[PDB]
Amino acid sequence: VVIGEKFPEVEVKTTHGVIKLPDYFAEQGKWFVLFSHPADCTPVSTTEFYAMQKRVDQFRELGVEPIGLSVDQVFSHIKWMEWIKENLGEEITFPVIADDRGELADKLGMIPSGATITARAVFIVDDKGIIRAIVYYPAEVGRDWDEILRLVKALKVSDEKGVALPHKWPNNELIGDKAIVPPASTVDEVKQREEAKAKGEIESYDWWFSYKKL
Amino acid sequence: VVIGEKFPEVEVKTTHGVIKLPDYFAEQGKWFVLFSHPADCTPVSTTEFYAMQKRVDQFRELGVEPIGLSVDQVFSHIKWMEWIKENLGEEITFPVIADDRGELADKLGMIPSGATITARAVFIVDDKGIIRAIVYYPAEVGRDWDEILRLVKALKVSDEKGVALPHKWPNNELIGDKAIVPPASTVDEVKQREEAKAKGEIESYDWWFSYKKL
Amino acid sequence: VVIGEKFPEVEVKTTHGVIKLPDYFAEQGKWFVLFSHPADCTPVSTTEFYAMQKRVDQFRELGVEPIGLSVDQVFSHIKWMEWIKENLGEEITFPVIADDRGELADKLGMIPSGATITARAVFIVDDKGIIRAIVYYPAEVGRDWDEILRLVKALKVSDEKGVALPHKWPNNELIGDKAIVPPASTVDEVKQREEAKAKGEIESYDWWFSYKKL
Amino acid sequence: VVIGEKFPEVEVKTTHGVIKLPDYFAEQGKWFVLFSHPADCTPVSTTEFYAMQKRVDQFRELGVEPIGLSVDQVFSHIKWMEWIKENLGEEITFPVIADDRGELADKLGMIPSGATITARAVFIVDDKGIIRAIVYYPAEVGRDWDEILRLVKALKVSDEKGVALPHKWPNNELIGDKAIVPPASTVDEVKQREEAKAKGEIESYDWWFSYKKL
Numbered sequence: 001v002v003i004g005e006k007f008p009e010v011e012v013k014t015t016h017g018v019i020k021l022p023d024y025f026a027e028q029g030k031w032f033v034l035f036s037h038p039a040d041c042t043p044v045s046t047t048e049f050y051a052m053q054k055r056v057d058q059f060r061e062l063g064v065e066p067i068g069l070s071v072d073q074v075f076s077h078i079k080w081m082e083w084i085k086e087n088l089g090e091e092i093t094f095p096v097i098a099d100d101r102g103e104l105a106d107k108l109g110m111i112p113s114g115a116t117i118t119a120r121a122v123f124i125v126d127d128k129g130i131i132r133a134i135v136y137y138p139a140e141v142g143r144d145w146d147e148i149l150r151l152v153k154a155l156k157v158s159d160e161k162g163v164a165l166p167h168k169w170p171n172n173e174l175i176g177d178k179a180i181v182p183p184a185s186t187v188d189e190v191k192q193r194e195e196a197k198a199k200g201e202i203e204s205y206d207w208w209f210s211y212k213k214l
Numbered sequence: 215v216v217i218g219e220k221f222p223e224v225e226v227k228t229t230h231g232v233i234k235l236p237d238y239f240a241e242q243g244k245w246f247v248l249f250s251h252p253a254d255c256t257p258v259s260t261t262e263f264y265a266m267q268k269r270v271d272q273f274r275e276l277g278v279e280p281i282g283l284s285v286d287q288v289f290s291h292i293k294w295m296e297w298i299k300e301n302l303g304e305e306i307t308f309p310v311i312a313d314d315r316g317e318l319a320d321k322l323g324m325i326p327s328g329a330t331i332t333a334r335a336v337f338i339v340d341d342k343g344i345i346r347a348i349v350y351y352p353a354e355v356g357r358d359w360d361e362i363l364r365l366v367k368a369l370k371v372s373d374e375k376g377v378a379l380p381h382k383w384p385n386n387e388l389i390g391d392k393a394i395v396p397p398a399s400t401v402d403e404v405k406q407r408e409e410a411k412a413k414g415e416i417e418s419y420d421w422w423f424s425y426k427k428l
Numbered sequence: 429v430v431i432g433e434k435f436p437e438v439e440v441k442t443t444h445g446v447i448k449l450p451d452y453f454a455e456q457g458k459w460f461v462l463f464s465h466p467a468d469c470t471p472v473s474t475t476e477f478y479a480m481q482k483r484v485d486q487f488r489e490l491g492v493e494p495i496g497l498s499v500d501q502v503f504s505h506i507k508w509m510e511w512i513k514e515n516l517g518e519e520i521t522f523p524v525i526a527d528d529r530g531e532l533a534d535k536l537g538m539i540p541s542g543a544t545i546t547a548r549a550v551f552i553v554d555d556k557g558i559i560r561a562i563v564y565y566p567a568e569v570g571r572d573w574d575e576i577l578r579l580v581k582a583l584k585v586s587d588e589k590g591v592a593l594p595h596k597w598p599n600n601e602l603i604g605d606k607a608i609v610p611p612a613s614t615v616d617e618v619k620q621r622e623e624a625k626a627k628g629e630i631e632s633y634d635w636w637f638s639y640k641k642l
Numbered sequence: 643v644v645i646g647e648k649f650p651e652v653e654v655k656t657t658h659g660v661i662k663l664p665d666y667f668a669e670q671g672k673w674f675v676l677f678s679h680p681a682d683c684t685p686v687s688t689t690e691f692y693a694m695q696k697r698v699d700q701f702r703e704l705g706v707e708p709i710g711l712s713v714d715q716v717f718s719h720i721k722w723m724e725w726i727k728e729n730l731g732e733e734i735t736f737p738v739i740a741d742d743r744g745e746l747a748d749k750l751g752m753i754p755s756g757a758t759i760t761a762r763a764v765f766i767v768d769d770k771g772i773i774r775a776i777v778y779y780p781a782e783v784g785r786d787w788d789e790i791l792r793l794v795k796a797l798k799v800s801d802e803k804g805v806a807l808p809h810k811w812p813n814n815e816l817i818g819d820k821a822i823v824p825p826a827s828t829v830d831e832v833k834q835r836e837e838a839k840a841k842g843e844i845e846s847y848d849w850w851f852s853y854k855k856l
């Protein structure tokens with residue numbers, strides 16, 4: 001699977017029962033962030049679950065639903081989440097997939113070389129079932145959910161306002177929170193663009209490098 | 215290709231002349247961060263080339279050589295780097311690949327659906343030539359090289375102290391800059407972890423969850 | 429071949445005429461215990477043919493058809509069974525394979541090192557034609573069909589009650605004839621095991637160790 | 643691997659440190675019973691460990707050393723054995739192999755179809771490193787160590803007194819505890835045999851079926 005491809009139609013067993021991806025989310029007009037961990041009841045994966053729960057509402061606020069995955073069975077997931085609630089005080093409210101035959105993991109390249117469990121994969125999927133971004137981190141290094149939060153904010157703003165987002169948006173080191181104006185490919189993108197410029201909204205470093213604020 | 219796989223043996227045309235990957239970097243005991251952008255003289259890509267250049271020594275300090283890639287030709291690259299130099303004050307000092315015919319981009323899954331240009335891909339390759347981490351951002355959303363810096367700091371510390379790094383390390387919400395002690399793989403390591411527990415050299419939330427200061 | 433593998437499609441000459449394995453037994457909804465002996469008119473083998481015949485109805489009761497095999501020819505078999513009949517009072521009522529050229533014996537790893545005759549092999553094959561258990565005893569030590577009877581009782585009860593059987597069941601040192609409740613593979617099964625725990629329908633030594641009466 | 647083949651020369655990590663099979667046992671003139679379980683901290687495997695410990699001295703009395711195996715790591719083994727001691731009151735005194743890359747398991751066909759963990763395998767290996775018998779039971783059915791105890795007693799008596807052992811020896815249903823006298827292949831086996839017969843020690847059902855007592 002690559003960026004731009006439809007997420008595969010698949011039935012998945014989860015701690016919230018059976019669900020049809022991507023449809024379950026797409027049909028509500030929801031994005032999802034699908035993320036793998038190698039094994040339940042590991043310390044890095046445990047800090048990741050803590051951290052994601054603490055951000056569950058920053059994702060959902062935007063119309064993005066977290067959903068986890070390992071090749072462990074659903075009994076493992078439950079026991080482990082009960083451990084996070086009793087010991088860390090955070091109840092897990094996002095579903096987790098029991099990919100217990102490794103079938104989905106395998107379709108999404110989530111299994112590293114010589115292994116039988118997933119790595120630390122991340123898929124952003126939009127309400128059209130389109131894979132918008134993919135991350136593969138290894139067992140030994142925990143993600144940072146604040147970068148995935150920035151990524152989905154960027155993607156949603158890109159869709160909504162037809163801009164591209166510079167390095168480290170919205171704290172880019174040349175134009176801070178200003179979005180780039182991409183080339184026009186539509187009459188409306190030529191009229192939208194021209195009228196932004198008559199409104200003062202556009203500046204530039206050259207003809208091919210123009211940017212505005214939202 | 216997946217995490218844990220040998221980076222494919224491959225000669226590449228660059229702005230700094232030709233090189234064999236991964237041998238060129240692995241024979242200097244260097245890791246490389248191989249990264250792509252869709253096209254030279256695009257503004258998001260330009261923001262990321264500025265950003266990488268300002269950070270080029272953060273990577274080099276750590277023995278990690280950055281290296282760019284697009285399907286644009288060496289002639290196009292020389293033109294674009296020249297523009298950045300005389301327009302933003304940064305000379306580009308890292309080699310950029312001219313991936314004639316997108317042959318390496320296809321090997322590494324860098325081409326998004328129904329395109330001939332790359333997306334915003336990142337590969338961390340180590341001094342053994344093993345792929346340690348993979349990121350695929352799309353054309354519309356530039357990366358944050360400080361997250362890739364954190365990732366390769368974490369990979370380096372993981373290899374060097376035999377530890378795993380928790381979420382957002384070295385700013386994990388629970389244990390800060392502390393590192394996860396992996397399980398004992400020998401009876402000798404069982405005795406050493408029992409000693410370290412007694413001394414408080416390692417600390418723990420449960421028998422399976424042990425961390426320490428570096 | 430290994431446990432979990434389809435028994436290989438194969439026509440075999442027997443004392444009761446020719447048959448297709450596993451289809452002959454699987455189309456009657458029968459399991460078979462396929463077992464070999466090194467040579468007709470050997471005394472250990474004879475003791476085991478007596479033993480199997482006295483037990484042939486214990487297996488048949490359970491829908492498990494016994495079936496013998498050696499590299500001896502049908503003519504040799506007819507002679508030997510005749511001897512048992514008129515000498516020990518038992519007619520042999522189960523089919524015996526004449527494995528011309530040891531072709532099936534090689535497929536199933538029945539030939540010991542630097543020999544052309546089988547050892548004392550046993551295969552439990554189910555009504556789906558799946559191999560469920562394998563035993564390889566040598567020429568010098570005859571089997572105990574009461575252990576193979578216990579094994580196929582246990583396999584049958586495992587399939588029929590969705591349980592796992594403890595050591596020496598139905599005479600386990602700890603729980604007697606009680607059976608291990610496997611882990612929940614669905615959220616629905618989590619709720620049903622929580623109900624059964626509350627009712628004492630299942631009993632337990634720890635959260636991962638639950639047994640019940642059949 | 644089949645009966646009659648030398649156990650492969652292999653270094654194994656165990657709860658008693660590193661050891662060289664078969665040499666570690668063969669060099670002391672010891673047999674070993676090598677036995678797999680699928681996963682540590684399972685209920686069937688747990689009753690098997692209980693049961694084997696309770697018989698550890700019936701095996702060792704005979705010069706046979708139990709040694710266990712799963713693909714779990716050595717930390718898993720230790721935690722699990724501590725659970726057997728605290729909860730069931732039996733300290734495990736036999737070593738257990740951490741076949742944590744599945745390498746030995748794979749050489750000995752211990753992995754069922756489509757799986758990544760072992761089944762319930764058993765190998766008897768003599769002081770010459772020769773595989774004398776192999777058992778494959780599935781996850782769902784626990785062994786009976788009393789049958790493996792009978793098997794090793796039979797094998798040792800076969801070696802020591804040049805006899806073959808009938809069905810269910812020493813409670814065979816025709817000659818009880820009497821051993822079969824195999825054909826002679828040596829002058830000494832002709833003199834040994836002839837002199838047993840002059841001593842009264844031999845009886846028979848026919849010329850090819852003779853047996854004596856020990």
Ligand SMILES: *CC(=O)c1ccc2ccccc2c1
Pocket residue numbers: 040041072076077079080636682683684
């Ligand atoms: C923590 C966890 O996921 C897990 C899963 C299965 C287990 C089986 C036996 C003992 C402990 C377990 C823990």
Ligand SMILES: *CC(=O)c1ccc2ccccc2c1
Pocket residue numbers: 208254255293294297
């Ligand atoms: C990358 C860029 O802006 C640039 C600079 C000089 C050029 C000369 C000729 C054709 C294209 C160019 C692009």
Ligand SMILES: *CC(=O)c1ccc2ccccc2c1
Pocket residue numbers: 468469507508511850
């Ligand atoms: C199996 C046995 O004892 C027996 C019986 C009759 C025979 C006739 C001819 C050749 C061999 C025989 C073996």
Ligand SMILES: *CC(=O)c1ccc2ccccc2c1
Pocket residue numbers: 040041042422682683714718719721722
């Ligand atoms: C019981 C056992 O073998 C085992 C192994 C690894 C574990 C990791 C996390 C939590 C519980 C575990 C239990």
